[PDB]
Amino acid sequence: PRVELEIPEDVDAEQDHLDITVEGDNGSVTRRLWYPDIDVSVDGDTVVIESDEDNAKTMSTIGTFQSHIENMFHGVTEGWEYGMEVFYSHFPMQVNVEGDEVVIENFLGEKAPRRTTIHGDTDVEIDGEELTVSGPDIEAVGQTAADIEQLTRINDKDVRVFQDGVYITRKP
Amino acid sequence: MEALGADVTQGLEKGSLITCADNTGARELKVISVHGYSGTKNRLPKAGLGDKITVSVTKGTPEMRRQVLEAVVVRQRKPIRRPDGTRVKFEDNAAVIVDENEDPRGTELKGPIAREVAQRFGSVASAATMIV
Amino acid sequence: PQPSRPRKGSLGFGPRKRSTSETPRFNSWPSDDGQPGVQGFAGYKAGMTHVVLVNDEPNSPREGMEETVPVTVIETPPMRAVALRAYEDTPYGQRPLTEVWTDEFHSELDRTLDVPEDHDPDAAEEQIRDAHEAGDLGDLRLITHTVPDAVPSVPKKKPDVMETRVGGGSVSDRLDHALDIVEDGGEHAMNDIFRAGEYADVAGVTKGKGTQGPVKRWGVQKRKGKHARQGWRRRIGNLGPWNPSRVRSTVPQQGQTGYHQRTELNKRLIDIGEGDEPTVDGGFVNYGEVDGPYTLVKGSVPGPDKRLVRFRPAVRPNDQPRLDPEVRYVSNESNQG
Amino acid sequence: KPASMYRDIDKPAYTRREYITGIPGSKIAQHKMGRKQKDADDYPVQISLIVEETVQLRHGSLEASRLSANRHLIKELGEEGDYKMTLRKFPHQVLRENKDGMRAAFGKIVGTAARVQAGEQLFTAYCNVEDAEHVKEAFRRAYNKITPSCRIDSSPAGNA
Amino acid sequence: AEFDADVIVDARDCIMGRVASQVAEQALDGETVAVVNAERAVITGREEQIVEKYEKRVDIGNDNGYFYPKRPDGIFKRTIRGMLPHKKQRGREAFESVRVYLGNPYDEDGEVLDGTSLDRLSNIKFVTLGEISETLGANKTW
RNA sequence: AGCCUGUGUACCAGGAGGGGAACAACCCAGAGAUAGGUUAAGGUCCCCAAGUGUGGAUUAAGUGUAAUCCUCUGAAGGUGGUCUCGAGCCCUAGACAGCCGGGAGGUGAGCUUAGAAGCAGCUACCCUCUAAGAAAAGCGUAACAGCUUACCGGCCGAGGUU
RNA sequence: UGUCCCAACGUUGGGCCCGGUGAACUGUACAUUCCAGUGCGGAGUCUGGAGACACCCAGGGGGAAGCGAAGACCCUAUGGA
RNA sequence: CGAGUGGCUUGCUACCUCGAUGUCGGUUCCCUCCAUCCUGCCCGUGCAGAAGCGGGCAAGGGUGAGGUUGUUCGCCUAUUAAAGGAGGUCGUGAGCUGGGUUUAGACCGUCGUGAGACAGGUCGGCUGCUAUCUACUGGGUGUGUAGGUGUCUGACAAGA
RNA sequence: CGCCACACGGGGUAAGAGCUGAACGCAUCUAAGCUCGAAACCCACUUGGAAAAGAGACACCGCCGAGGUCCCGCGUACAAG
Ligand SMILES: [Cl-]
Ligand SMILES: [Cl-]
Ligand SMILES: [Cl-]
Ligand SMILES: [Cl-]
Ligand SMILES: [Cl-]
Ligand SMILES: [Cl-]
Ligand SMILES: [Cl-]
Ligand SMILES: [K+]
Ligand SMILES: [Mg+2]
Ligand SMILES: [Mg+2]
Ligand SMILES: [Mg+2]
Ligand SMILES: [Mg+2]
Ligand SMILES: [Mg+2]
Ligand SMILES: [Mg+2]
Ligand SMILES: [Mg+2]
Ligand SMILES: [Mg+2]
Ligand SMILES: [Mg+2]
Ligand SMILES: [Mg+2]
Ligand SMILES: [Mg+2]
Ligand SMILES: [Mg+2]
Ligand SMILES: [Mg+2]
Ligand SMILES: [Mg+2]
Ligand SMILES: [Mg+2]
Ligand SMILES: [Mg+2]
Ligand SMILES: [Mg+2]
Ligand SMILES: [Mg+2]
Ligand SMILES: [Mg+2]
Ligand SMILES: [Mg+2]
Ligand SMILES: [Mg+2]
Ligand SMILES: [Mg+2]
Ligand SMILES: [Mg+2]
Ligand SMILES: [Mg+2]
Ligand code: NA
Ligand code: NA
Ligand code: NA
Ligand code: NA
Ligand code: NA
Ligand code: NA
Ligand code: NA
Ligand code: NA
Ligand code: NA
Ligand code: NA
Ligand code: NA
Ligand code: NA
Ligand code: NA
Ligand code: NA
Ligand code: NA
Ligand code: NA
Ligand code: NA
Ligand code: NA
Ligand code: NA
Ligand code: NA
Ligand code: NA
Ligand code: NA
Ligand code: NA
Fold first, then answer.
1. What is the CB neighbour count within 10 angstroms for residue A90?
2. Are the CB atoms for E9 and E97 separated by under 8 Å?
3. How many domains does chain A have?
4. Residue E124 and residue A34: Cβ atoms within 8 Å?
5. Adjacent-strand bridge partners of B39
6. What subunits make at least 3 CB pairs under 8 angstroms with E?
7. How far away is chain C from the Cα of B38, in angstroms, using its nearest Cα?
8. Is the separation of the CB atoms in E31 and E6 below 8 Å?
9. What is the DSSP letter of E117?
10. Record: contact C91-E63, CB cut-off 8 A
11. Where is the signal peptide (chain D)?
């Protein structure tokens, strides 16, 4: 099979080996697209994903490579944004971006601060009780966002009662 | 538990017959177990000054005799070490019968007591005439 | 159902054989954090006494109070870093590249070595720097020896040579730091490396005891009760099951016990001084009188009096340094009585 | 006791009741279920449970599965639903057990079983096109209570 | 150092076993062989299982012993020994006239043997010797 | 049962040699000495003589590389893992899915009931508007409200579904 | 009250080294073995691997189904008492 | 109801040993298995919390002291994080013990005319050997690498 | 029976919690890819270790002389050695 992806005018995509770099006004993203017998090339102004095999396993990945590239096109232009809302019941939770990692303090009344390092060139803007994770690499952003929600994981007690923590409000 | 503030060479064992330093009606005590203690194969469970042991009443009033109560070790013949190096030892081995709240069962504590026992069992401490 | 029980003795210090070198050899070194410096020193065990100290621990309820602490006295005179050995990074691990020596040698170093008569320092230095330029320079350590002659109680004059590592800021800077120390005459002191209050790792070759039975050597039991009177007293039950049909090396057996190398971790340096402040009345039994550069180490140290013991900045300390502890008293009472 | 002891057809046919005595009765309640007054032809759909391997199924097993199948139909079509199921095989083969070691080992009578050759119909239900998925589920529950693997074969019914 | 190898083989991206099989045949033939870039040699299959087999070999042992190598250096040589009657005079002579090296210590580039190459474009399920060695706990000297 | 006890037969016993890792009875094979040659069983990546043989396909589990077997397990049951062959229905008069929009009136149908208005229960389940839209398939409220399902239209565009 | 917790130190005689004296048990052969397998189903010797430079001193006895006794148990014998 | 795994129990068989492979229980000392009792990390809950209950991964470490009984098993007490189960010739008598089974003495009950018997009870009732080989714990002497002194490296190996 | 010392932290995983993501336009933690996550694994730390047959490296001394053994006084060592 073969799928041609017309690259946006704002974008500039280059590929060496199995690594594909996509550059745009919002930044640059590089990914490795490695799978048996699937060749991904840059033909002038269209990325080609093709293979001689048409089996279910191959088709699965060709479809995966497509969405990965499209998402890169979108990231280097419009970008990726996840919204979050910090919520607490009794203990006022302080959330700050310190250095290269969002730090959460006094979670559920804890003395020890919970922290997690931000992935890649992802930006975590905080304004009051709202957070906004953004960047060109959906992989890095989506994870950083998830890491934030996961940072307030609770296994010891009932989640339905103890509902404190940050949460993904808007998904791109 | 809270640090004794003294190194202790346990001088008692499970089965040891000691003195009940109080007016409860129980005169002689028999050590049965040592709270929070777990030994090793063949080792006879050891108890020392500052420990909360389980006891059986060997001698005393028919009422108290044959009962299984908790107690605190107040005195022991085998020495103990203090921060300044000095060793301290008593004329006998003794314990004071205690309840669930670690409050002495009886009203009065006969004979002297170790100061280190105070940091652990206050109600027992603030019931002693002498504290060495 | 036969209660469980941990095995008799550790399998981590074997084989339990006689040590190859009476002089200990560290198989680990501290990290390259601070400024360039030698990562170790040595001395000679003298004996023990107690010291009265002020509680240094901020987390202790006794903080500030008097406290009696056991101490081993070790005569630690100046040593001499006679050479700079550079290792190169090869596909088979680290390998000695070359050495930079000196001319100023202690009068009695030849009692052990074939002291250099014709050596080219510069060439070696060049080779080391060229290797560094190539990015093949492993680490840098100094060849060091003691001055037993400086310690009267110690009969030997034949110096104990040992290689100590230099951990510094950058490879380029500690290289220079090393070269400098050496050029002078390699003379250095415990003050140069340590400061009272720091934790050191003391390595040493334990007190020898010759051959000993399982009971002493592995801490196995003695036959008990009736069994103790049958003809067996200090011999273990059996050498192993029917199968496997062989005695496993893990069963507690007779052999060389003592005279092994040991590296005790986190030894607090109570005080580094000089003179006779620590010497015991009537002399340290089986050692002598201490009147010179010394180190007071908290607690015990491996080895017998007169033995060589090595120091090293604790590679895995649990506590934070509590510098220069207050010594309100040092016992000088006789160790006989 | 396990079916492993009686599932194979290796011993001779032991059915002659004129020579065997003390044979336990069959646990099989009844072979004909549903609306037995109505005829099999009065139904558009006919689904049989086909045993894929030649085996011996003990009476407790025939009862255990028949029950679990019909009990489902009663639950889905009602105690008087419009269907009729049939357990066509009967446990003629008498089973022994040597319950002394191998001396005078001829066993004593402990039970009965049905010999089913592979490809045969053990159960056959007749229903109306709507209840066809229920009868298929009854059989899926039934084949879980007998030794062999089975096929749920739909005979007259091309309403898919 | 200095091994007068008649043949220098490059194992980079080559299937270890197949290379090993050919090196043995040549060593028994009298050829002095030097296997090069062993850390970069390859071995197909599901990594997790491959590693399990090698970790088990490291664990297997007793007083008598079972010295199993962890470095790609030794692993490749042991792989080759398994293809030679190393206990026989002729077999030991061959095995000793063969040597594996990390990287390439020679001036010449090693030659890639026929049928030993693995097409990385066509394959995703395989492992590198170094990758196995690092997992085994070997000190990465290469 | 590597059990006990028959029967026919061939073998071991008393049968070498070749193969099977080894191994009385499994395979080839029945064998004077010596010698050249060709095969049998079995095998041809190395160990190890002969293929890293050819055409084609499957498998990603190291499955497997294990004829027979005390010896080599692996079962009922299950599997949108993957490959292949067929049948029925739907589809550029636009299918399947997704997203958007609409899902309306007489009327909150009658009855029951303080109340019940698609949706506690009982009965019926009619006709208008219209391109659709149930006297309502599923949640929801005390009952309403609120949320989707049926059904229609739109966007999209190629196969889809059983 | 060292039977035990829980072991220590010491004493005498041995043990170890040297001079002198000087046996016995045991021995199909070979034999540096270990893990597995196989085999009359409990192998240092067969098969596959692993390990293994030779000799010597001391040790406590895991294995040689260790050495010692043509099994006392059990059955058999047209045995004995 | 149906399908299995294990090889701890019991039974079956009679392949191995009757020119002997020393018993049960215990002890001591070593290794292992996981079907996990505790401890680490998890999922569900009839999960508010606390205390639990059920399940998953996981064998690193731990899993102890006592009263009756020869007992294994088991019953019981107090402690405990918990006081898990099992394999190694039912690990371990050229290691120990010798209370039980099972010699010769004796008694009681039952049976027998009797000698005498008992899948009944009871008291007493022996533990051989100087290690040749192999195995391992430790100690030396030589040879190989191919003049010496001193310092190291680290393939690998052990650890809880 | 007394006294001293005996981590943490990294890396990769299991069960599990997830991200991006297709086969299957949606959905999906998995199929390719990725972020995490056990007292368990690897490193770290301790002990042994040139007989590692690829039998190692460096430095200096020396080949008519460096160094070693014997001998002598002794032990921080030791059953002989
Ligand atoms: Cl207890
Ligand atoms: Cl004993
Ligand atoms: Cl090993
Ligand atoms: Cl060979
Ligand atoms: Cl692949
Ligand atoms: Cl013939
Ligand atoms: Cl494999
Ligand atoms: K016998
Ligand atoms: Mg809770
Ligand atoms: Mg005991
Ligand atoms: Mg005796
Ligand atoms: Mg003294
Ligand atoms: Mg005094
Ligand atoms: Mg015959
Ligand atoms: Mg060939
Ligand atoms: Mg397999
Ligand atoms: Mg078969
Ligand atoms: Mg062999
Ligand atoms: Mg006989
Ligand atoms: Mg008899
Ligand atoms: Mg007669
Ligand atoms: Mg024997
Ligand atoms: Mg498990
Ligand atoms: Mg273990
Ligand atoms: Mg046994
Ligand atoms: Mg046992
Ligand atoms: Mg024995
Ligand atoms: Mg014996
Ligand atoms: Mg003996
Ligand atoms: Mg007896
Ligand atoms: Mg008795
Ligand atoms: Mg008796
Ligand atoms: Na004796
Ligand atoms: Na004796
Ligand atoms: Na034995
Ligand atoms: Na009978
Ligand atoms: Na079935
Ligand atoms: Na492979
Ligand atoms: Na190994
Ligand atoms: Na014949
Ligand atoms: Na053969
Ligand atoms: Na395999
Ligand atoms: Na005594
Ligand atoms: Na032995
Ligand atoms: Na089974
Ligand atoms: Na059995
Ligand atoms: Na015999
Ligand atoms: Na026993
Ligand atoms: Na465990
Ligand atoms: Na008991
Ligand atoms: Na036995
Ligand atoms: Na015994
Ligand atoms: Na005995
Ligand atoms: Na980890
Ligand atoms: Na060497």
1. 9
2. no
3. 2
4. yes
5. none
6. A, C
7. 13
8. yes
9. B
10. no
11. none
